């Protein structure tokens, strides 16, 4: 009760500090009258921005490097597939469910289960299997081939959690299962780039897991937090440090709901990881 | 816990299971009287000593402080006796752990007795669904009030917690199981206190006001929920996981905790409490 409440106070204060002012120099602004942020108040830390036209950030919490982003707006699809291609994406985790995707009010393009042409990019996907994660939650696996004029064809593994519960929170147990599936798909594809001699492997802003739910601050932060607690080398980090690093690297809302922070506390607890600093 | 301790736990439990295996017309197990099918599955029998009625495959279980009734899903021909058990028991909560998909598969012969209104010999029942409660990971408990009316007898209302979308394929995590054990306890606690303010004589009877729990055979998911309910009680602290599964098996049959995945939920919950797995 006590330490959790204190953890919330420090994170609320940080959040308030990070709040976006009008045309805030810390946050990426829409250059050119195109809509950049899907939600007016979930903005992109400029400094860690991957591209000027996407609301997406490079995050690194300890040893864990990922890209967290919002679900791309229809107009952002070509830049979004360019980000996935240049990054040589070892795994793309989509945490928005099929019910969310299919509800047109939300305007979330089904870009990875269909084949399409986006400016100069042609993509096609193939479903290869479903993997159970626990409690009936299933990850549907797809191969996304991105082809571009004059450029190489890049294949991106997609882990889609098709039936992520729209109502309840996902347990820490299913979250750890999903973090582990995401690391193993990433490890495998990374070793394929390595055996083919891609320069990609030497460049630390490449081969990063790309993770997004709808806005890229709730579920996204739950999974990234779990992937960090999973890598041994992150031993020294408290929950206070991890959420803090995510917030100053994307925006103040990373780990948006209490239900998401409780999953991070449960996992921490199971490791003897500290919640707070001191 | 350690792979080693878990493996030893499985050895002790397998030996007990083999000690308890039913011989032909075994005196420890309830035998079908006449040409009436008693057992929904012929290998999953009913311990005679703790049996509730001679015509049901259902047992009184008491692990430490926790008293429940575990039964198989009643066969069509057992529905009147089943409703009599639920009424005489003054059942505070009936937890049904078989999903809607299982119930609707006619090959399985599982009568949908709690979501419909019907007449079974002299008993008339009716249900009303009152609300769904979310347990975690998209699993939902659908709540129903079952009213059992019988000629010359009182009308009794049984709260039903139905886990409508219990996953048919995977195991249910310890987190959702803990959420389900707690809903069941709270529903029971409430109906128990209504009988108490009304002055029910039943609250002093230790064979009454027991949670009735059943899945399909009443040995797998049933054993998972009952183990969790025992661990939610402070007076059961001294008991290892070996003692709880061993008592359940001697009180019903030795298939209680039917799968390894069921045992692993019990080990995860145990671990989170610093409860021991083994005895010594």
């Amino acid at each position: 009760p006590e330490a959790r409440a204190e953890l919330s106070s420090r994170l609320t204060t940080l959040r308030n500090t990070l709040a976006p002012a009008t045309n805030d120099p810390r946050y990426l602004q829409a250059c050119g009258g195109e809509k950049l942020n899907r939600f007016r108040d979930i903005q992109c830390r400029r400094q860690t921005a991957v591209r000027a036209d996407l609301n997406a950030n490079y995050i690194q919490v300890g040893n864990t490097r990922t890209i967290a982003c919002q679900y791309p707006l229809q107009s952002q699809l070509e830049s979004h597939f360019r980000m996935l291609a240049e990054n040589r994406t070892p795994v793309l985790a989509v945490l928005a469910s099929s019910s969310e995707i299919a509800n047109q009010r939300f305007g979330m393009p089904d870009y990875f289960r269909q084949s399409g042409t986006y400016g100069s990019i042609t993509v096609e996907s193939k479903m290869t299997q479903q993997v159970g994660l626990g409690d009936g939650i299933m990850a549907d696996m797809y191969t996304l081939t991105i082809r571009e004029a004059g450029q190489k064809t890049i294949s991106v593994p997609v882990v889609h959690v098709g039936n992520w519960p729209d109502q309840t929170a996902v347990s820490s147990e299913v979250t750890k299962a999903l973090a582990s599936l995401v690391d193993q798909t990433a490890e495998t594809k990374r070793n394929m780039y390595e055996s083919k001699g891609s320069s990609a492997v030497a460049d630390d802003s490449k081969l990063r897991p790309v993770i997004h739910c709808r806005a890229g601050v709730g579920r996204t932060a739950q999974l990234i937090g779990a992937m960090c607690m999973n890598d041994s080398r992150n031993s020294q980090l408290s929950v206070e440090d991890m959420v803090s690093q995510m917030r100053v690297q994307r925006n103040g809302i990373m780990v948006q709901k209490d239900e998401q922070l409780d999953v991070l506390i449960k996992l921490a607890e199971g490791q003897g990881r500290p919640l707070l600093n001191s």
Side-chain angles (χ1 to χ4, degrees), chain A residues 146-199:
Chain A
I146 308 164
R147 296 160 196 236
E148 201 201 329
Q151 305 308 312
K152 299 155 175 174
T153 296
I154 297 299
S155 296
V156 176
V158 183
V159 173
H160 182 207
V161 186
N163 64 340
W164 190 289
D166 295 9
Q167 298 305 324
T168 25
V170 163
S171 64
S172 47
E173 281 175 274
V174 172
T175 297
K176 189 173 156 191
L178 181 59
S180 178
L181 219 212
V182 176
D183 291 322
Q184 290 179 76
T185 311
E187 182 69 315
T188 305
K189 192 56 178 148
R190 201 174 257 138
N191 293 338
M192 304 298 130
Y193 282 103
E194 187 175 359
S195 52
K196 294 312 221 184
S198 199
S199 47

Side-chain angles (χ1 to χ4, degrees), chain A residues 44-66:
Chain A
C44 183
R45 191 61 173 240
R46 215 238 176 278
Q47 200 206 1
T48 46
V50 182
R51 295 175 78 77
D53 60 1
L54 292 186
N55 177 313
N57 291 89
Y58 287 114
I59 293 190
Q60 188 178 332
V61 174
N63 239 286
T64 309
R65 294 155 195 235
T66 57

Side-chain angles (χ1 to χ4, degrees), chain A residues 1-275:
Chain A
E2 293 70 89
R4 314 219 303 113
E6 180 59 29
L7 169 63
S8 301
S9 301
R10 298 185 203 192
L11 300 169
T12 297
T13 294
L14 177 70
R15 185 225 210 169
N16 293 320
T17 304
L18 291 179
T22 295
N23 176 72
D24 191 323
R26 300 174 291 185
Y27 289 95
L28 199 86
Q29 307 299 318
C31 287
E34 293 286 310
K35 192 178 163 62
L36 175 70
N37 304 323
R38 181 175 289 269
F39 293 106
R40 285 205 183 159
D41 62 305
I42 306 303
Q43 290 179 20
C44 183
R45 191 61 173 240
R46 215 238 176 278
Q47 200 206 1
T48 46
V50 182
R51 295 175 78 77
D53 60 1
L54 292 186
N55 177 313
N57 291 89
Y58 287 114
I59 293 190
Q60 188 178 332
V61 174
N63 239 286
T64 309
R65 294 155 195 235
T66 57
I67 284 167
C69 56
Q70 73 179 16
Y71 199 112
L73 299 167
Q74 270 278 154
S75 42
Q76 292 168 344
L77 288 179
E78 187 178 23
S79 317
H80 194 73
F81 289 120
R82 279 203 218 289
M83 163 170 92
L84 301 191
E86 289 166 356
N87 171 51
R88 299 290 112 118
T89 312
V91 66
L92 169 110
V94 187
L95 314 184
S97 69
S98 306
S99 345
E100 289 161 47
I101 287 178
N103 177 342
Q104 297 192 302
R105 306 180 201 118
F106 298 170
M108 289 189 296
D110 187 2
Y111 73 93
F112 58 90
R113 295 146 85 209
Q114 288 178 128
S115 297
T117 314
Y118 305 97
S120 43
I121 284 180
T122 284
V123 327
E124 44 183 275
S125 33
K126 163 204 177 146
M127 190 178 159
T128 54
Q129 59 178 154
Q130 298 187 259
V131 178
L133 293 175
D135 281 338
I137 312 292
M138 308 296 285
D140 304 320
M141 312 284 289
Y142 295 85
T143 301
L144 201 301
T145 301
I146 308 164
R147 296 160 196 236
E148 201 201 329
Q151 305 308 312
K152 299 155 175 174
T153 296
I154 297 299
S155 296
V156 176
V158 183
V159 173
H160 182 207
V161 186
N163 64 340
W164 190 289
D166 295 9
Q167 298 305 324
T168 25
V170 163
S171 64
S172 47
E173 281 175 274
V174 172
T175 297
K176 189 173 156 191
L178 181 59
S180 178
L181 219 212
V182 176
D183 291 322
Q184 290 179 76
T185 311
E187 182 69 315
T188 305
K189 192 56 178 148
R190 201 174 257 138
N191 293 338
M192 304 298 130
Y193 282 103
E194 187 175 359
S195 52
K196 294 312 221 184
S198 199
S199 47
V201 300
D203 183 344
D204 282 7
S205 53
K206 278 180 187 180
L207 293 172
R208 280 172 190 239
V210 175
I211 297 150
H212 68 83
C213 50
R214 203 176 160 195
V217 300
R219 292 164 183 178
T220 305
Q222 199 183 301
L223 185 55
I224 293 173
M227 290 170 67
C228 301
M229 288 184 205
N230 206 357
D231 172 77
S232 40
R233 312 173 299 214
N234 295 319
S235 46
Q236 288 298 112
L237 289 188
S238 61
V239 178
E240 187 183 317
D241 288 309
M242 295 172 161
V243 178
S244 296
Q245 288 186 32
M246 288 187 247
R247 287 186 178 194
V248 309
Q249 294 176 52
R250 179 148 160 70
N251 63 58
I253 336 292
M254 289 297 283
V255 181
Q256 183 179 33
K257 301 180 189 174
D258 291 283
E259 52 153 85
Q260 297 158 358
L261 188 63
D262 298 347
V263 175
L264 289 181
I265 287 177
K266 303 168 197 165
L267 295 169
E269 177 168 23
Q271 304 190 311
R273 184 173 304 266
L275 295 197

